[PDB]
Amino acid sequence: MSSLVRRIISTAKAPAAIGPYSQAVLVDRTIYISGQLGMDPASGQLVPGGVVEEAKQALTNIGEILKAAGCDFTNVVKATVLLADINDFSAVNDVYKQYFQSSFPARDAYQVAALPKGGRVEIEAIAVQGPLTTA
Amino acid sequence: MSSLVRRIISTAKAPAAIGPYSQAVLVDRTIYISGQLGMDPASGQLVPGGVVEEAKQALTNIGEILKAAGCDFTNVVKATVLLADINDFSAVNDVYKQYFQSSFPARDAYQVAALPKGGRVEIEAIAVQGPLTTA
Amino acid sequence: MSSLVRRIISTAKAPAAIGPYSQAVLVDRTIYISGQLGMDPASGQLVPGGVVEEAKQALTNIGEILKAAGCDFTNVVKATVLLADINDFSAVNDVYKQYFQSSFPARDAYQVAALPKGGRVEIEAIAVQGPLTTA
Known part of the structure; x- marks a missing residue:
């Protein structure tokens, strides 16, 4: 008992x-991050250029929310990539992989x-606040 | 070790x-709640009136499952709103927001x-059993 | 602190x-398992026979990942069944239920x-490493 x-993460x-949602909620050590579109933080508008540009912006936004919670991409344990078009899988994968230097x-x-x-991609994530152990 | x-929540x-599913599972302190449609608890039938009425019923059902686990809406840390029609976003948001008096x-x-x-909305939720700390 | x-599960x-994903990640005691298609482990190809055969293979694959993490189906706390066709609900339910002997x-x-x-079904799962208590 x-x-x-439990902390609201906001940056x-x-x-x-x-x-009616928060950017993320930290509870105990787990951080549940709301799905991010490829929205420019200053304007709230989707960045032009289609799915590859949107994917980069969505992941940048997740990165800033992780940073606010004292984390980085190494703290992510589970992610979800929602696409408007399954044909964009390869292209989105090549963007996504650049945000993970480790496992x-x-x-x-x-x-x-x-x-x-009308977003073309949304990225959702679960992270765990460090320190985390290595193999 | x-x-x-681990407890099955049932009300x-x-x-x-x-x-073949339980209404919710409590494991450690985290409660994973199965997605709720706008179904009347007594009949199992979708309530009439479309998405706004269904959304209200779905959230009422989540509320009863939270109550069974000794929780309320303040214990929810992450939710998912699945729509049959993206045009219902505004309307569902206005219903949803009424269930959260806090962050x-x-x-x-x-x-x-x-x-x-043929539901028009489903609401999924993750909660953490209290007590939880305040900002 | x-x-x-945090361990990558791989079998x-x-x-x-x-x-760019791992089969599963164990973090603390929670195991987040990547969504499984009905893919044959040796070939990586979808098994023939449509949704019922795919569902059986997807669940077999989850079973092997659970086993690698020292778990079985009794450790699953939350699952997600994604269908290409809602009409397959009954058929997939009858497959799914055979993997759970308990609650x-x-x-x-x-x-x-x-x-x-072009999969017809994907199964996602969250498990918690035992021991877990009984009712």
Whole structure:
């Protein structure tokens, strides 16, 4: 019956909420990060250039939320890649892989019917606050 | 190598299962709640009135499952809103927000191809059993 | 500020990765398992026979990943069943139920627009390493 830490993670380096959600919630040591679109943090608008540019921006936004929680991409344990078009799998994979210098997280990836704002990709993530042990 | 608590959460105040799943599982302090449709608990039928009425019922059902586990909406840390139609985002958001009097959970929301029973909305949730600390 | 265990789970009894992900990640006591298609572990090809055969293979693959982490299906706490066609719900349920001899996990199940490789079903899972307590 200990009181576990629960903290809302919020940074102006990631887009403002455009509905009733927080950017991320840290609870105990697990960080649940809200799905990120390829939105520019300053404007809230999707960046032009289609799925590859959107994917880069979405991952940049996750990176800023991780940083706010004292983490980096090495703390991610599970991610989800939602696509508007399954044909973009290869292209998104090549972007995604550049954000992990070490062992990849668990992952799910597939096509949904529609994302908010007509996005072409959304990235969701679960991280665990460090320190974490090595193999 | 402690033995962690794992408990099936079951209440007659939420719909009966219509396949091989439990309403929720508590494991350690985390509660994984099965996605709820706008089903009436007594009948198992979707409530009439479309997405807004379904969303209200789905959230009521989650509330009853949280209550069974000694929790309320303040214990939710992450939710997922699956829509049959992305155009219902605004309407569902206005329903959803009424269930959180405090800081919102992390969230994902988007359109899938089809839900069981022709539902227009499904709400999934992860909660952590209290006590939880405040900011 | 303890260092929590984080381990990549990898077994040749499940399919090789065909992108930048691990089969599963164990972190503390929670195991996040990447979504499994009905892929033959030796070939990486989808097994013939459609959704029922694919579902059996996907669940077999999850079973091998659980075994690698010292677990079995009784350790699963939450699963997700993604379908290419909602009409396959009954058939997939009858396969799925055969993998749980005890109380079912929490679950989500619904239709997405498309899965990798034209799969008809994907199964995702979260498990917790034992020992777990009984009711």
